[PDB]
């Protein structure tokens, strides 16, 4: 009944007002481990800095989604932002691992909306996920992996010279 | 089973192989085409270098496609490259109706991997070919058939005087 | 029978093609280390923009013979481009030894091809030859062995932090 | 009996006079196409000047034998310059035609004196040639052979608008 509502079904609505409570979750996670490698039994200040970069962008796909819910004449609803999963990460791998497994379930998620939105034949909602959202899943996926690959080569966790130089060269000097 | 796999099907990730090697293919017959127009005999030079640039932008599709198999947790998978059909080409417009035939088979092969990406649900691979090839093929077969017409025009194969005139002023001065 | 033709002979024209053939075939041995160390499992990203860079170079080293070629009146008669011999490179220090070998194989071509233009009292394509690709070869194998004697230093193959620092400090950051 | 005089032969430094001859003689034969396509019934300005050009060209192979034979130690010997062979042209076909066979007529007398160098084992005198005679040969004999592939493909002798356009397109504005 909005007066821009056109080819806008209920459940596409009500899916993505989900995703945006999950880009949400994902960013306060990404925020949990940057306060982690930010203290100062932990101090691996790039890593920290990359995980709090990682939040921020989950924040921004976040209000991407209420801009677009608006955009189609649908309602934004929101729900509590749940804690993330852990109150401490353990180290630079545990957290990579956690971060390829949050990249995989919120892929997953946008997958499942996109096959919604085929379904209820929303050609603008399936390029959306498409141009805004699925590549950079599958990049950050990517490099998250890649990542790790190079975190178990340096010996992690046992090995704190890995885990120092890993911050030193792989991830941005912030 | 790699750590970045996600929706990715087993036969999209051999297709992708496939296309790879076609990438390869077309860029050799596209080497051979400015071989030939280079030769004395020939003598065609901005025609040459067209197929030269041709050669190498049919390159480039395929590392994209090397970059893409990682990207997704595939494999690359190489075969040989096989020699092109011809070992000489005749004249402009023999050689530039094989290129419409080239980008024709390629485009052919890439709705094929989109009707099989469709068939697999696997929008991130549909909107990979959307977005970095389809459309290319489209304009570069509209490119050459416009050649094809103007080749005619000029009096190909019999006119040297046309095919002269096409080399100076319908093809990029090199 | 080419109009430019002058004191090249048969022999010469035929082992510039099966030269030709085997540059190409050295770009491809690359192609496939670069897509190796892409691989989210090896993640070596600095080696695997060594090993691309290293595949476009023996790619204009291709390009150079056929306009050498067509220079002299000689024909190119392409053959296929036999794929690499291994589809995994195991990890640096292997794939650097496999390049070793590699381009030792092509300078040991370059020589007989030498030999030959020599025998035949071809002094253009020794010049040639000399001036455009033996010291390219004598540069980068030592340039190869170079870094096989530090990645031996570094502890290669059991030492993944040695390879993780050779990735970020032998070869350029890409 | 110079006193900068080593390794260099009398037979090579009487081959070197007679070579200097030759340069002399080819630039003379180049400035007479140069008028002859500057005659007002002849009035094909571009080719003119690319005749112009060929001759100040081999007028520069000469001086740089005189300066080579002082280098050596050897004395420059002169010899009458003979008029060339013609005193009018034909057409650009006809001229182009004559100026391919001059080249290879240089080149013939360069590769010969590469054979008497290397016969006396003079090393400095082959590089000499290599690296600043004989690929300059090389080029231009390609540059003249596609020339005429061009010409006879703009039908002359006998198409007027063909030798025209030949004019205004193949060789440089001036
Ligand atoms: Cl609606
Ligand atoms: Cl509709
Ligand atoms: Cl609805
Ligand atoms: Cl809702
Ligand atoms: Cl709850
Ligand atoms: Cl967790
Ligand atoms: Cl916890
Ligand atoms: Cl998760
Ligand atoms: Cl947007
Ligand atoms: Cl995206
Ligand atoms: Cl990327
Ligand atoms: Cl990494
Ligand atoms: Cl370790
Ligand atoms: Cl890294
Ligand atoms: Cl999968
Ligand atoms: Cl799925
Ligand atoms: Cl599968
Ligand atoms: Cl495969
Ligand atoms: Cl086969
Ligand atoms: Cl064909
Ligand atoms: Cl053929
Ligand atoms: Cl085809
Ligand atoms: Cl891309
Ligand atoms: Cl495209
Ligand atoms: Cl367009
Ligand atoms: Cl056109
Ligand atoms: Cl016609
Ligand atoms: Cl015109
Ligand atoms: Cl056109
Ligand atoms: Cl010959
Ligand atoms: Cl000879
Ligand atoms: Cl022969
Ligand atoms: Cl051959
Ligand atoms: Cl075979
Ligand atoms: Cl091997
Ligand atoms: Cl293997
Ligand atoms: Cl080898
Ligand atoms: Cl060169
Ligand atoms: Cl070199
Ligand atoms: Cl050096
Ligand atoms: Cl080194
Ligand atoms: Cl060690
Ligand atoms: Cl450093
Ligand atoms: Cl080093
Ligand atoms: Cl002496
Ligand atoms: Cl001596
Ligand atoms: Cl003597
Ligand atoms: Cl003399
Ligand atoms: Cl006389
Ligand atoms: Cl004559
Ligand atoms: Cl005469
Ligand atoms: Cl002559
Ligand atoms: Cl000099
Ligand atoms: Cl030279
Ligand atoms: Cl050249
Ligand atoms: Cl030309
Ligand atoms: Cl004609
Ligand atoms: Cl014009
Ligand atoms: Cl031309
Ligand atoms: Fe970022
Ligand atoms: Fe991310
Ligand atoms: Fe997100
Ligand atoms: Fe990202
Ligand atoms: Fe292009
Ligand atoms: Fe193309
Ligand atoms: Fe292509
Ligand atoms: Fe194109
Ligand atoms: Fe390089
Ligand atoms: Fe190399
Ligand atoms: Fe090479
Ligand atoms: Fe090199
Ligand atoms: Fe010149
Ligand atoms: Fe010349
Ligand atoms: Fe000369
Ligand atoms: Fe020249
Ligand atoms: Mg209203
Ligand atoms: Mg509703
Ligand atoms: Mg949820
Ligand atoms: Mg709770
Ligand atoms: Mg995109
Ligand atoms: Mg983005
Ligand atoms: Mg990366
Ligand atoms: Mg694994
Ligand atoms: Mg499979
Ligand atoms: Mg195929
Ligand atoms: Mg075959
Ligand atoms: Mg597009
Ligand atoms: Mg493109
Ligand atoms: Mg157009
Ligand atoms: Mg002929
Ligand atoms: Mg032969
Ligand atoms: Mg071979
Ligand atoms: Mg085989
Ligand atoms: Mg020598
Ligand atoms: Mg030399
Ligand atoms: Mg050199
Ligand atoms: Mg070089
Ligand atoms: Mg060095
Ligand atoms: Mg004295
Ligand atoms: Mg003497
Ligand atoms: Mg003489
Ligand atoms: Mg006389
Ligand atoms: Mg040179
Ligand atoms: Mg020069
Ligand atoms: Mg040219």
């Not at 459940?11 to 999950?22: I, K, Y």
């Not at 545990?94 to 939105?117: I, R």
């Not at 490099?143 to 790790?148: S, V």
Request: glycine share 4%; charged share 30%; hydrophobic share 35%.
């Amino acid at each position: 009944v909005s007066q821009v509502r056109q080819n806008y079904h209920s459940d596409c609505e009500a899916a993505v007002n989900r995703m945006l409570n999950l880009e949400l979750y994902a960013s306060y996670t990404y925020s949990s481990m940057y306060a982690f490698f930010d203290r100062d039994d932990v101090a691996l200040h790039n890593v920290a800095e990359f995980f709090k970069e990682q939040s921020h962008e989950e924040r921004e796909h976040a209000e991407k989604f209420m801009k677009y819910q608006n955009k189609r004449g649908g309602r934004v609803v929101l729900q509590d932002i749940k804690k993330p999963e852990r109150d401490e990460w353990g180290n630079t791998l545990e957290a990579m691992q956690a971060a390829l497994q949050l990249e995989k379930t919120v892929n997953q998620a946008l997958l499942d909306l996109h096959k919604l939105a085929t379904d209820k034949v929303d050609p603008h909602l399936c390029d959306f996920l498409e141009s805004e959202y699925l590549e950079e899943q599958v990049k950050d996926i990517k490099r998250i992996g890649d990542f790790i690959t190079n975190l178990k080569r340096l010996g992690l966790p046992e090995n704190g010279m890995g885990e120092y130089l890993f911050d030193k060269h792989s991830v941005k000097e912030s």
